[PDB]
Every structure is written in C-alpha cells, then in structure tokens.
Amino acid sequence: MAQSTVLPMHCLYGIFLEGNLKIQKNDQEGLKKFKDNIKKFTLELDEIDKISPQSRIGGAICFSSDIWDTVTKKISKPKELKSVNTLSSYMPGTSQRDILIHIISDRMDTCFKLAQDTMRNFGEDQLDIKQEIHGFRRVEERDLTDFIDGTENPDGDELRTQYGLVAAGQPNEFGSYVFTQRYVHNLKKWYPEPLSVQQDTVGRTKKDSIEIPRDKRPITSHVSRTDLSENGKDLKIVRQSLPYGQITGEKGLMFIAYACSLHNIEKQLQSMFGQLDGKHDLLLKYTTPVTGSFYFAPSKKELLEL
Amino acid sequence: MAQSTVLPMHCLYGIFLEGNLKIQKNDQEGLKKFKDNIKKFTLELDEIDKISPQSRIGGAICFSSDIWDTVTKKISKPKELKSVNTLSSYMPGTSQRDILIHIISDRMDTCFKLAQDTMRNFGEDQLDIKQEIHGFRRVEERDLTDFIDGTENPDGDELRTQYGLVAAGQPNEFGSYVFTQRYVHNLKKWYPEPLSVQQDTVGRTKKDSIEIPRDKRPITSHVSRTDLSENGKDLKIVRQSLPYGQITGEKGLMFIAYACSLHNIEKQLQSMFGQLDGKHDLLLKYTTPVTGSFYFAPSKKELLEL
Ligand code: HEM
Ligand code: HEM
Ligand SMILES: [C-]#N
Ligand SMILES: [C-]#N
C-alpha cells in the first residue's frame, strides 16, 4: 500500500531527481499527461520487479506543500507538510523543490533504466530538474567519514512501518514525510583528525560502530544530537542515505529520511543546528548541507488518485 | 601474466582515473615511493579478488610515452608508443596525460574501494588527476544510442590474448597498448532519427545487433569504418568501454581499447576521422570526443620491475 522506498533495507544504489513542475495550475491537459506519466512510473516499477527480482527495485514520487494544490484537488494536504525554506534562518542550504523521484536498486543498470525511462516520459517540458545524484553503497556500508552508517536505523517491516509511514486510519495513511539534504564532506579536514576526535564527533567507535557510553561522549556528538525522545516516545526515522561523488572531487552524503510525522525529522534538525539548546552537531565542523527539501510520498492508492 | 583488465569480459562497473605525475625525473626518493604505491595497488587487487570473488575485480596502471623515461631506466619503451596529441590535426579532444588507472568490477563498492584506496596511497603529492569517470553497464549492454555494444569484441582468453596483448617473445610481451577517449552524446539529435537511419549509422540492426551486409550499408557506417584488415589479417582490438553520465546532463561513452599493437587502434581512428578517404564516421554526427590519451599497460612483471 505504500510506495516502495521506505520498507526495504540495504539498497546498493539510489538515484535522486529533484526539481520543479513546469505545468500551470489551470493547464488541465498538461496535468492529465503528468498524471499518466506517474502511472507509467508505477507500471514500469512493477515490470522491472518481475523481470529483475535480484534488483530489489523500489521507487517513490514525492510532492512539496507548495505544489500540492497544483497536482490535486481530491487528496487533502498532509497536516504537517510545509516548505523547508522556513528553516533557512538557522539551517543552511535550503532549496525547496516541487518534486522528488527516488529510485533504489541492488543494480545500477536497472536503477538507471527506470530513472532514464521516467525522465524521458515526463520530459523537459514537464520537469525542470535541479539536481540529479547517483548514490552508491560503499564496502561495509560506511559513509565517506568511514564510519558505518545505519547501525540504529529501524530494522524490519514492522518497525519501519511504525516509524516510516503514516498510521492506518489517519488521513493520508501509508504515505510518508520525506526530507532530502545533500552534504559535501571536507575530508581534507576530517582525515587528519585523531581517532578520539572522530569518535567523539560521531558518538560510536569507528571500527565496529559500538556506542560510546553517554557519559563519555559529548552532548554535541552526532548520535547525542539525533537520538531524541518526547513523552517517552523515541523520535525515530527511516534513513535511506547513500554516499555519492568523486574520489578526486566533490563528494559527501546524499541524506534522505522517511517518517510517519515530519516533526520527528524537524526536531532532529533543530537539535543538530542549534535551535534546541544553542549547540550544534560536531559533525557540522566537517561537512556542509548544500541542498534541502521537504516532501510527502503518498500511499500508492493516493498517488494514483491525485 | 598480464594486468587484469584485458582478458575479462562483461564488467558491470569501471572507474577511469587519468592525470599527470608530479614527481621529477631527479627525485629518486619520490620515485621509490611511487613504485611502492604501484606495488600496493597490485597487492590490494589480489586481496580483493580473494575476499570478493563475485566482484571479478581487475585493474591496470598504464603509462604514456612522455612519462616513460621518468618512471623507468630499466624497461625499454614500447616500440609504437607515442602521444595522442600528434593526432590533434584531425581528431578533436586530444588531451594526453601521463598516467591511467583503470579498475573494473561487477560491484561498485569494490571498484570504488580499490580506486579510493589507490588514490589515497599515491596522494595529491604524486598524482594530479585530470579526469575521473564512473562507468556503468546498462541493461542488455547497450550504449546510450541504445545499440548493443560489444557484439564483435574478441571473445575468450585465446582471442583476447592474441589481439589485446603483445605477443610472447616480443619486447614488452604481455603488455598492452591502451587508448582512452571520452565521448559526449547528443541524444536529442539521435532519438528523432528513424530506425533505418540509426541502423545505417551503426551498420547493425538495433534490436538484435545483426550485421547489415557490407554492400547494403554506407561505407561511413561505424562498422564499415572500424572493421578493417591488412594483408588478410584483421585489425582487431579489445574494447572495455562503458556508458557514463547524468540523465539530465552530460552523458556518453567512456571509450577504452586494449591492443597488441597501437597500429590496430590508430588505423581505425584515421578511418573514423576522415584521414583515409576524406569521409567521417556517421556516428560522429551524434557524438563528440572531448578527451583522448595513448598509454601502455606493462605486463605484471615489467610493472613491478620499473
Ligand atoms: C553528513 C551527514 C551525516 C552523516 C555522515 C551521518 C552519519 C551517521 C552515522 C555514522 C550514524 C551512526 C550509525 C547509525 O546508527 O546509523 C548516524 C546515526 C544517525 N543519524 Fe546521521 N549522519 C548525517 C546526517 C544526519 C541528519 C541530517 C539526520 C537527521 C535529519 C541524521 C539522523 C541520524 C539518526 C536518527 C541516527 C541514529 C541515532 C540513534 O538513535 O542512535 N543524520 N548518522
Ligand atoms: C561514441 C563512440 C562509440 C560508440 C557509441 C560505438 C558503438 C559501437 C557499436 C554499437 C558497435 C557494434 C557492436 C559491436 O560489435 O561491438 C561498435 C563496434 C565497434 N566499434 Fe565502436 N563505438 C564507438 C567508438 C569507437 C571507437 C573510437 C573505436 C576505435 C578506436 C571503435 C571501434 C569499434 C570496433 C572495432 C567495433 C567492431 C567492428 C567489427 O569488427 O565489426 N568504436 N561500436
Ligand atoms: C545518516 N544517514
Ligand atoms: C565501442 N566501444
């Protein structure tokens, strides 16, 4: 019932396409073609899944709050959805776009095939793509900081449904709030740091990702910043982030998170970027966000009924 | 034994690193460090192969004619090796570099790990990288023209040794001449051509890559330009080219060929670029080379004995 990028784990490749919708709100014939291209996407996802089961293909199309009422008059807007540009007073790199297409695979050839076919269907007259990122998993699932990324990511269908998807019975059930943020790593600055500095920064050990005990790690460590609770409930999210970039050029992390509630993501951003207690995540001394957007990925039914 | 990028077929990923050596001919300490890093490269290739046999990993380090005497006083220079910049009067995009590192894999994570570890070993104090390309195989091994690439590539160890490696008993036996050339495709010019025009351009059928008879295709079809013989012997080469690039940006073919004789490659370039009969390859109406370099990949024994 959900789109197919939230529940599956450990994809090896991901393609991220973000951009703006060039169709006008009154252009009903253009919007009808746009919605037929959406149906073509869901149909091609299904076909690749049957032809290439080893790809474990997944895909989602997601919409911003500013474009929501252009694309639909039938589906009510998700209650928390807003522009990420409202965070620009304290978080750098905000760049709210209309539309995200996120495709995951264990093979680049099928990842690329779906992305290419989809972009050819929509075309330049419907989508103005601002960013196209080819993400790939590294050996031992390490981020380019060379720490393992994913240790405390929710595991399994039950937990990823609980934390990643709007609850059954709620408006927009089985959709998901989405946050994307491209980071550029300063590895010339990070590589020379002593191991104790690197482990203080992240809050886990480098080799095995063992948690540093709370009383020995700084309150500004990354895991101290992002492991948050409210009323005894953990504000967990489902991350699908992947490394990207050139060894000899610009590189970093293509961050993406799916969540049952946008609040779970936004409170972590307030924590990392100094809005909760005045203090910033230590990781931000070594990496910089240069894009950012909020979206909602509808359930499969609501996607097809926009 | 050869380096390990010539004989294996059908790699799914390739990383191409081309650039210039920053070590002076008079720096014996720097040259000894450089050669220790070459040794580390060959040791890591062997280690990845034992740990990840499913990667089918391969790698080669290759040297230009300009840099040959800087890196060795012991191995004689290959008899045909020269700078590709000597073709600049008729072939666009020439950009001769000192060094090529070519790594191939069936998994991007191990391809990238070897490429990144190698670049960190050499460092920016030894190598100035001018181009880093991440190539990937597409579905059905099709070039971005959507024709299958590789149908007449020599198959199996026997033929790829014969055409890809210097013959046993010759100077530099089991090394290979190498040519790299990055193409940028103009798919907006190509896609609207009818199938009849596309098949005339390549010289094979699109769906099944069946050869169109020589008397029914233009002399400037790509197959007529490149299927060459002299004195009854075919001028075959071993191609390892891969697509690369962004769907919404610059994309094309990262061409690379290995040959037992540089003449086999250069005669095909003269053919394609109008130097033999004044006529250009039809494929060049739709794609443009923007880089180019000639190198020699020594045998594994001459590589370690530089
Ligand atoms: C440069 C960007 C980032 C890097 C390199 C990075 C890396 C990591 C690493 C290495 C871990 C520890 C292993 C794990 O449990 O996954 C981690 C944990 C985590 N990260 Fe990030 N991260 C980044 C940005 C973000 C952002 C922007 C958020 C939130 C919006 C976030 C949320 C989390 C969460 C929730 C955890 C798990 C914390 C826990 O409960 O223990 N990260 N990150
Ligand atoms: C944009 C660049 C290029 C594209 C898209 C391209 C594509 C192709 C295709 C589709 C084929 C037919 C299938 C096959 O037998 O592999 C082919 C054959 C071939 N290509 Fe290219 N090619 C390109 C550049 C080059 C260059 C620069 C050379 C030589 C230096 C070359 C040498 C060959 C050879 C030798 C064959 C096999 C011909 C035969 O014996 O039948 N190609 N190419
Ligand atoms: C953290 N992705
Ligand atoms: C032709 N590669």
Which DSSP string corresponds to A192-203?
A: TS-HHHHHHHHS
* E-only strand ranges, A37-122: 58-63, 99-105
In degrees rounded to 5, what are phi and psi of residue A185? -85, 140
Residue A302 CA to its chain's centroid (Å): 20
Resolution in A: 1.9
DSSP H helices, A191-244, are 195-202, 222-226
> Which amino acid would we find at residue A115?
A
* E-only strand ranges, B200-250: 229-230, 233-234, 238-239, 242-245
State the pairing for strand pair B233-234/B229-230: antiparallel
In the three-class reduction of DSSP (H, G, I as helix; E, B as strand; rest coil), residue B9 is classed as coil
Q: How far apart are CA B202 and CA B212, in angstroms?
A: 9
* Residue partners of B235: CB distance under 8 A and separation at least 6: B228, B229, B263, B264, B267, B268
Cβ–Cβ of A139/B247 closer than 8 Å?
no
Q: Which two tokens stand for residue A44?
A: 């091609």
A115 CA to centre of ligand 4 in angstroms: 24
The answer to whether the annotation marks B137 as part of a ligand binding site is no
Atom of ligand 3 nearest to the CA of A241: 2
Cβ–Cβ of B137/A17 closer than 8 Å?
no
Nearest CA to B173 out of B262, B34, B300 is that of B300
Q: Which residues line ligand 4 (CB under 6 A)?
A: B 149, 239, 241, 255
Q: Note if B149 is an active site residue.
A: yes
Q: How far apart are CA B67 and CA B258, in angstroms?
A: 19
Q: Which two tokens stand for residue A197?
A: 């500095």
In degrees rounded to 5, what are phi and psi of residue A40? -60, -40
Looking at chain A, after which residues does the C atom sit over 2.5 Å from the next written N, breaking the chain? none
Q: How far apart are CA B152 and CA B252, in angstroms?
A: 20
Q: How far apart are CA B240 and CA A20, in angstroms?
A: 38
The H-or-E segment that residue A189 falls in is helix A187-190
In the three-class reduction of DSSP (H, G, I as helix; E, B as strand; rest coil), residue A262 is classed as helix
**Exposure of A140 in the CB half-sphere (CA atoms within 13 A):** 13
In the three-class reduction of DSSP (H, G, I as helix; E, B as strand; rest coil), residue B153 is classed as coil
Q: How far apart are CA A212 and CA B52, in angstroms?
A: 31
In the three-class reduction of DSSP (H, G, I as helix; E, B as strand; rest coil), residue A56 is classed as coil
Q: Which two tokens stand for residue A91?
A: 């978080």
Q: How far apart are CA A159 and CA B95, in angstroms?
A: 53
User: By the 8 A CB rule, do A100 and A62 touch?
Assistant: yes
The answer to whether the annotation marks A160 as part of a ligand binding site is no
Residue A69 CA to its chain's centroid (Å): 22
A188 touching B (Cβ < 8 Å):
no
In degrees rounded to 5, what are phi and psi of residue A178? -125, 140
Q: How far apart are CA B161 and CA B236, in angstroms?
A: 11
Q: Which two tokens stand for residue B243?
A: 């697509």
The H-or-E segment that residue B18 falls in is strand B13-21
What b/e sequence results for A25-51 when a residue is b if at least 16 CB atoms lie within 10 Å of its CB, and e otherwise? eeeeebbebbbebbeebbebbeebbee
- In DSSP terms, B21 is beta-bridged to B127
CA-CA-CA-CA torsion sign (B158, B213, B184, A109): negative
In the three-class reduction of DSSP (H, G, I as helix; E, B as strand; rest coil), residue A139 is classed as helix
Q: Which two tokens stand for residue A244?
A: 């990207």
**Exposure of B245 in the CB half-sphere (CA atoms within 13 A):** 19
In degrees rounded to 5, what are phi and psi of residue A68? -55, -50
> Which amino acid would we find at residue A194?
P
Nearest CA in chain A to B114: A139
Please identify which of the residues A98, A149, A200, A281 carries the catalytic annotation. Answer: A149
Q: How far apart are CA A39 and CA B258, in angstroms?
A: 45
User: By the 8 A CB rule, do B272 and B266 touch?
Assistant: no
In degrees rounded to 5, what are phi and psi of residue A187? -80, -25
In the three-class reduction of DSSP (H, G, I as helix; E, B as strand; rest coil), residue B201 is classed as helix
Q: How far apart are CA B65 and CA B152, in angstroms?
A: 29
Cβ–Cβ of B13/A108 closer than 8 Å?
yes
Within 8 A of A136 by CB-CB distance, chain B residues are 108-109, 112
> Which amino acid would we find at residue A181?
Q
Q: Is B160 in the pocket of ligand 2 (CB under 6 A)?
A: no
Atom 2 of ligand 4, nearest CA residue:
B241
Q: Which two tokens stand for residue B33?
A: 């460090």
Q: Is A7 in the pocket of ligand 1 (CB under 6 A)?
A: no
Residue A167 CA to its chain's centroid (Å): 19
State the pairing for strand pair A233-234/A229-230: antiparallel
Angle subtended at Cα B142 by Cα B135 and Cα B45, rounded to the nearest 5 degrees: 35
Q: How far apart are CA A203 and CA A151, in angstroms?
A: 12
User: If you search the block for the tokens 């007259």, which residue do you land on?
Assistant: A125
DSSP class of residue B156 equals H
Extract long-range pairs of A163-166: CB within 8 Å, 24+ residues apart.
A163/A236, A163/A237, A163/A238, A163/A259, A163/A260, A163/A264, A164/A6, A164/A7, A164/A237, A164/A238, A164/A258, A164/A259, A164/A260, A165/A2, A165/A6, A165/A258, A165/A260, A166/A78, A166/A260, A166/A261, A166/A299
The answer to whether the annotation marks B173 as part of a ligand binding site is no
Q: How far apart are CA A244 and CA B109, in angstroms?
A: 11
User: By the 8 A CB rule, do B63 and B21 touch?
Assistant: no
The H-or-E segment that residue B223 falls in is helix B222-226
Atom 8 of ligand 1, nearest CA residue:
A149
In the three-class reduction of DSSP (H, G, I as helix; E, B as strand; rest coil), residue A11 is classed as coil
